[PDB]
Write an enzyme that holds these catalytic residues in place. Structure first.
Site, short mmCIF file in Angstrom:
data_model
loop_
_atom_site.label_atom_id
_atom_site.label_comp_id
_atom_site.label_asym_id
_atom_site.label_seq_id
_atom_site.Cartn_x
_atom_site.Cartn_y
_atom_site.Cartn_z
N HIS A 941 0.63 -1.40 0.04
CA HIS A 941 0.03 -0.09 0.06
C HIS A 941 0.94 1.19 0.04
O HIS A 941 0.73 2.12 -0.80
CB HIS A 941 -0.97 0.06 1.27
N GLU A 942 2.03 1.51 0.90
CA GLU A 942 2.46 2.55 1.01
C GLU A 942 3.93 2.65 0.05
O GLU A 942 4.17 3.94 -0.52
CB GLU A 942 3.22 2.67 2.64
N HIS A 945 1.95 4.31 -2.50
CA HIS A 945 2.00 5.75 -2.49
C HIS A 945 3.20 6.51 -2.85
O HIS A 945 3.17 7.54 -3.51
CB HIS A 945 1.72 6.28 -1.03
#
Length: 1295
Positions: A941-942, A945
């Protein structure tokens, strides 16, 4: 028989000590019970001889020897003084004449009038006596001659100050090694042509190089400064506060740092801290600043070129070319001016004025030209570059942003910068007097000496390193005895004496014991160890015969006795405390600041207990003392050590703490503290280096700044270029033929794990130690484009060997802590170790799997961009043995992990409350743990990002309205669990035979996706099944009654709200109940698509959705709507659904990159769809343009595309469907085999489930458990996903 015939033999030569290479001598004295330099101050033949000589040199260190006598004589009818040194058996050569002792001639005062030109002490004394007048300079002149302080803050402490200080008699001169502001007050002076070269000024008050203030018309001109500056309450490159002064044509090239958290007003600037005059100017001025500051409040004004500019003060034709870096965006930070606005009741007519000002700054957390932007701004001209103007704005995850207070310009700066065409001057270096070298280049005879061979000049210059302190005749003899095949015919740097890899320095202590080896360091970087045995008891200079070369070797020390000095100064060196006031006086520090950030709490007592041996070695390697019975030089040495005991002990503690690593049993603290001549540069001395490091101040001794401190202070004392280049040189000499990454991994006590990707080509790329593709942690930590380079020294100097684990991969490098996973179930010993090691290996494998999948999927040479390095910290929430709890323990804490790492690495974590957050170039695990299984999914997820804008997309930025969390949660992050009924792509995790019931995901992503086309086939087949199920349920809900259709079906809609920029074009999805007429329209499946109908079962929302939200789309909940935002961005739910549908239809690069990644901005601008966001004219990509570009002209609207997809699926399945579907569909009393063979059975069962779930409505908190349609769809999906391996086929064609 035999007739005797004589043979003439060569004559043997007498050996004596000699000083061949001499740069300049210095005479000292004990006139006032303190040792002071004397420079021609000897005006009469002195009665007694308490003087001593310090013969400096450029070949090797200085040789302090006493004075035997003084007499006045004339070398050329000019009155000079025959200062004669003394030594046991020294000799001096002058025109092939041997003098018994070393004598130089010291002339009396020179006739130079109209200004004091001699030296810094004379200059400052003259300006203190007479503030007015004119004082030029006569030679490049260093500022360490003055004792620098009793409690003073400047070299000249009078208000009026050097009214006419020129620095060009016939050529420009310079002032070296400044340590405090030069004048402390400047009023009506005309400083001109000065050039400070290496300034290290640090003052708790306002700090600046050439002055603290400028009261009247002080015409600074051509004053170029340099060096590092550290302040606490103000900073200025040249002058901290000018009023009515014209700082024209000056410059500043250095670092500036005010990182203290003080809540007080300061005006720091790279050239002038404050302009406050109607007549103040800054003309044709440069500022190459590297500023790292902390404003923290709207009063502190970081300022680039200048700070506060008030009362109509101008900035003309200025220029700044550095990297300004604030920490928090709160204060008024500007690239060029921090504040143009008055501090009193401010009318706009008295604001600051700019003109023709450029700025090439990479400013962070600040504006680009002026920090304070207001309506009546008065810049009237300003330029810039395409650089980073990042301002850290806080979403749920931090991210970069722009500032938009700038006038933009391209890269024609290489021409725009040179409007002021002056580029170069010629500042002279420190002057020398003479050189009593014997080998004169002119040839009276073809041999320079009696026996000098012209072919062996390199051999002579290599012998001069083996045999210092020896007469030139013996030098040429041992040059002639060098074997022809011997490798002494190449250039030689200085040699060291290891004693079986121990690097001994105390030669008086260890001469009797044979120095078993001798390491020769060559210019080629190749080394060669020789064997030497202590030959002859020549106590003045120890002599070691080389094993079988027939040469000799004498270590560069005179075996002096340091017992007197050690016993005299040990008492005053051991009465020093870390928390005492003396340490706070040697460090230019206030009383509020704390010494925690030094992190020398324990090494201080470690080096205070072991001070005697280190002091003896330091004195042995410091200089050369030639005495037998008197102590005129020993008293000078003990005075030097006593006066600087705190600084000596602090420098020793610093260099012992941060340089404890060893190269194959040879400690590097020996090579760093001692043996400064290892890289050449033998001029330097160890004791003075340690002293000047100790006096560096609080900022230079700081733990975070070890690399910068080395580069700017510790270098140019060793001859190296940088810290890591010095480490590489040491590794080249000691422990060769081993890659420096392997040396780092065998020295570092952190559990380093590196996982090279499974693809052969990338593995071959990574397994090469050449950087920019290597996976080695040392090849990335020491490379540029890595913010925290101060991580290397703490990692090498790690005490306990189980405190830190390091997970490195392609495109990431992650740090953790064993104490993070410590708990009551995992005590400190032998359980936490195995757990952390096994889980670190597993997590490294999972991360490598993730980037292996993304390296396969990326095709458009973005895979070459997957070789970055983004750090990954852990929580800092260290545990304990008693409870399963955590303590944040940011800094200031006695946890050894924090003191030995994460503190010396100058990274301070924001410490949010939950989850993990990304910074845009970093990643932190606040609540989740890196070694858990959910750590992999949150890492995905990050990292989506971090690598969204450039790597994962084709380099095109995110779409206009789509937020950072639009991509991660719903599109590119791996699913949280296996049984998640969401449309995602499994990247990291790998399930093993236990999740195989209710799996609904891809078990083996390392074997599933092997190309882009494999991902496209997987998505196409999954969406084939999804569309089949959606058709089956739609053809049932279309044949349904009023109320229950209203209950099951809801209409989605796009509602546009105003984005906090100027625009209101970005859409937001909103699920609303639908009207009676719309329900009456729903009489077939196509009308469901037409009327935007969505299904209420999965998306339990009945109101508006949200932008930048964590939404996911279900596999089994149908979205019959084809929602197109003809105005702009589509939204966050239909955006995800359409992106996945385009990935099903078109590939990943031809589809779903255009839809979500701003790729058609150029065409949108060309066709007129342009908008204004944050003052920037940017194109707007309407969804109709995306549809027209992805598919040329086949589809006119998204409704047609959706209906065509459904039509294709229908024509495929209505005839052909796989018989293998064998879902039981029931837990108890089930139908043994549904044995779906033709789609009629599936349609009948789906229709029955829908009809029986319309009645007996669930409508409860549990729609997933009590609904029959969801169970049926899940059973069908699982049965089909089991039939096919994963998703290679759903309807076999051809027959």
């Amino acid at each position: 028989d035999e007739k005797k015939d004589d043979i003439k033999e060569e004559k043997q030569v007498d050996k004596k000590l000699e000083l061949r290479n001499i740069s300049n001598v210095e005479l000292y004295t004990l006139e006032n019970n303190k040792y002071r330099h004397v420079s021609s101050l000897s005006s009469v033949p002195t009665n007694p001889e308490a003087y001593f000589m310090k013969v400096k040199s450029e070949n090797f260190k200085d040789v302090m020897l006493p004075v035997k006598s003084i007499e006045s004589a004339r070398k050329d009818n000019q009155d000079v003084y025959k200062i004669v040194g003394q030594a046991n058996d020294l000799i001096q050569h002058e025109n092939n004449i041997t003098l018994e002792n070393y004598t130089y001639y010291l002339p009396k005062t020179v006739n130079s009038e109209n200004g004091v030109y001699t030296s810094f002490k004379n200059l400052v004394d003259a300006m203190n006596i007479n503030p007015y007048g004119t004082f030029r300079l006569g030679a490049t002149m260093d500022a360490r001659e003055v004792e620098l302080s009793d409690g003073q803050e400047s070299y000249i402490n009078k208000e009026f100050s050097g009214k006419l200080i020129g620095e060009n008699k016939g050529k420009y001169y310079a002032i070296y090694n400044l340590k405090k502001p030069l004048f402390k007050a400047l009023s009506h002076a005309t400083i001109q042509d000065l050039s400070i070269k290496e300034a290290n000024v640090s003052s708790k008050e306002d700090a600046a190089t050439i002055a603290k203030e400028a009261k009247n018309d002080t015409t600074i001109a051509n004053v170029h400064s340099s060096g590092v500056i550290a302040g606490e309450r103000s900073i200025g490159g040249l002058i901290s506060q000018v009023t009515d002064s014209t700082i024209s044509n000056s410059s500043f090239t250095g670092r500036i740092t005010n990182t203290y958290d003080t809540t007080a007003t300061y005006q720091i600037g790279g050239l002038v801290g404050k302009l406050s005059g109607v007549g103040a100017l800054i003309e044709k001025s440069i500022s190459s600043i590297d500023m790292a500051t902390n404003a923290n409040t709207g009063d502190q004004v970081v300022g680039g070129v200048a700070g506060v500019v008030d009362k109509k003060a101008t900035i003309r034709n200025s220029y700044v070319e550095g990297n300004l870096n604030n920490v928090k965006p709160f204060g008024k930070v500007g690239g060029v001016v921090g504040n143009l606005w008055d501090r009193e009741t401010s009318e706009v007519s008295n604001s600051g004025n700019l003109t023709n000002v450029l700025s090439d700054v990479n400013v962070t957390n600040g504006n680009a030209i002026a920090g304070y932007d207001f309506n009546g701004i008065k810049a009237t001209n300003t330029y810039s570059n395409k650089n980073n103007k990042v301002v850290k704005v806080v979403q749920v995850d931090d991210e970069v942003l722009s500032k938009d207070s700038e006038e933009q310009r391209g890269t024609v700066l290489e021409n725009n910068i040179v409007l002021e065409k002056k580029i170069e001057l010629v500042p002279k270096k420190n002057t020398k007097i003479e050189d009593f070298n014997f080998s004169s280049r002119y040839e009276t005879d073809y041999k320079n000496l009696k026996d000098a061979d012209v072919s062996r000049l390199r051999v002579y210059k290599n012998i001069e390193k083996l045999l210092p302190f020896y007469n030139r005749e013996t030098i040429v003899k041992y040059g002639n005895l060098v074997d022809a095949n011997n490798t002494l015919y190449t250039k030689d740097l200085v040699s060291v004496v290891p004693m079986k890899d121990k690097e001994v320095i105390s030669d008086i202590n260890k001469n009797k014991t044979s120095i078993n080896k001798l390491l020769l360091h060559y210019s080629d970087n190749t080394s060669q160890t020789l064997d030497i045995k202590y030959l002859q008891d020549f106590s003045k200079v120890a002599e070691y015969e080389i094993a079988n070369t027939k040469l000799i070797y004498t270590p560069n020390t005179l075996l002096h006795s340091y017992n007197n000095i050690v016993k005299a100064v040990l008492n005053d060196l051991k009465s020093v405390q870390y928390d005492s006031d003396a340490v706070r006086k040697v460090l230019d520090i206030s009383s509020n600041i704390k010494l925690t950030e030094l992190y020398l709490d324990e090494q201080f007592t470690k080096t205070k207990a072991n001070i005697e041996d280190s002091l003896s070695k330091l004195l042995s390697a410091d200089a050369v003392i030639a005495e037998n019975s008197n102590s005129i030089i020993d008293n000078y040495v003990i005075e030097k050590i006593k006066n600087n005991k705190e600084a000596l002990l602090l420098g020793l503690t610093y260099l012992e703490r941060w340089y404890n690593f060893k190269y194959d049993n040879t400690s590097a603290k020996d090579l760093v503290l001692y043996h400064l001549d290892f890289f050449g540069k033998s001029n330097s001395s160890a004791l003075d280096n340690v002293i000047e490091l100790g006096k560096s101040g609080f900022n230079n001794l700081l733990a975070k700044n070890n690399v910068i401190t080395y580069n700017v202070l510790l270098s140019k004392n060793y001859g190296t270029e940088g810290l890591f280049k010095a480490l590489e040189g040491y590794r080249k000499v000691f422990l060769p033929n081993v890659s420096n990454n392997d040396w780092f991994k065998t020295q570092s006590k952190a559990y380093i794990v590196e996982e090279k990707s499974t693809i052969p080509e990338v593995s071959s790329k990574q397994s090469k130690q050449g950087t920019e593709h290597s996976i080695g942690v040392y090849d990335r930590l020491t490379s540029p484009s890595w913010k925290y380079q101060s991580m290397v020294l703490p990692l090498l100097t790690l005490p306990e060997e189980k405190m830190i684990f390091m997970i490195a991969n392609i495109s990431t490098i992650g740090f953790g802590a064993y104490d993070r996973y410590r708990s009551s179930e995992y005590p400190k010993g032998d359980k936490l170790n195995r757990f952390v090691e096994e889980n670190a290996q597993a997590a490294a494998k999972r991360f490598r799997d993730h980037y292996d999948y993304w390296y396969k999927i990326l095709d458009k040479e973005n895979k070459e961009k997957l070789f970055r390095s983004v750090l990954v910290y852990d929580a800092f929430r260290f545990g304990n043995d008693t409870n399963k709890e955590t303590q944040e323990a940011n800094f200031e804490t006695n946890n050894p992990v924090i003191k030995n790492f994460f503190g010396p690495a100058g990274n301070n974590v924001v410490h949010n409350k939950h989850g993990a957050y990304a910074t845009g170039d970093a990643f932190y695990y606040m609540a989740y743990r890196m070694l858990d299984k959910s750590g992999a999914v949150t890492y995905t997820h990050e990292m989506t990002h971090n690598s969204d804008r450039e790597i994962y997309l084709g380099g095109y930025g995110r779409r206009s309205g789509l937020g950072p969390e639009f991509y991660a949660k719903g599109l590119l992050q791996a699913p949280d669990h296996s049984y998640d009924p969401t449309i995602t792509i499994n990247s990291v995790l790998k399930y093993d035979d236990s999740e195989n019931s209710t799996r609904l995901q891809i078990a083996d992503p390392t074997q599933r996706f092997t190309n882009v086309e494999d991902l496209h086939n997987y998505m196409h087949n999954m969406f084939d099944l999804i569309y089949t199920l959606e058709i089956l349920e739609g053809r049932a809900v279309a044949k349904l009654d009023y109320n229950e259709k209203n209950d099951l079906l809801r209409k989605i809609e796009n509602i546009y709200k105003k984005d906090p920029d100027g625009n209101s074009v970005y859409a937001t999805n909103a699920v609303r109940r639908l009207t009676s007429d719309e329900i009456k329209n729903l009489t077939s499946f196509d009308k469901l698509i037409e009327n935007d109908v969505i299904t209420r079962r999965g998306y339990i929302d009945q109101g508006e959705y949200e932008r930048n939200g964590y939404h996911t789309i279900n596999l089994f909940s149908p979205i019959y709507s084809a929602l197109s935002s003809k105005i702009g961005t589509p939204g966050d739910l239909m955006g995800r659904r359409m992106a996945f549908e385009l990935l099903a239809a078109k590939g990943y690069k031809e589809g779903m990159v255009p839809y979500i990644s701003n790729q058609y901005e150029k065409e949108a601008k060309d066709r007129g769809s342009k908008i204004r966001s944050y003052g920037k004219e940017i194109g707007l990509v309407t969804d109709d343009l995306v549809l027209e570009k992805v598919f040329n002209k086949k589809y006119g609207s998204w409704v047609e595309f959706k209906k065509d997809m459904y039509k294709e699926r229908v024509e495929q399945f209505s005839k052909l469907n796989r018989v293998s579907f064998f879902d039981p569909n029931g837990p108890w009393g089930r139908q043994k085999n549904v044995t779906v063979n033709n789609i009629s059975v599936l349609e009948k069962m789906i229709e029955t489930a829908v009809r029986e779930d319309a009645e007996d409505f669930t409508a409860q908190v549990y729609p997933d458990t009590n609904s029959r349609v969801l169970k049926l769809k899940k059973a069908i999906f699982k049965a089909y996903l089991d039939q096919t391996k994963d998703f290679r086929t759903s309807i076999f064609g051809g027959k």
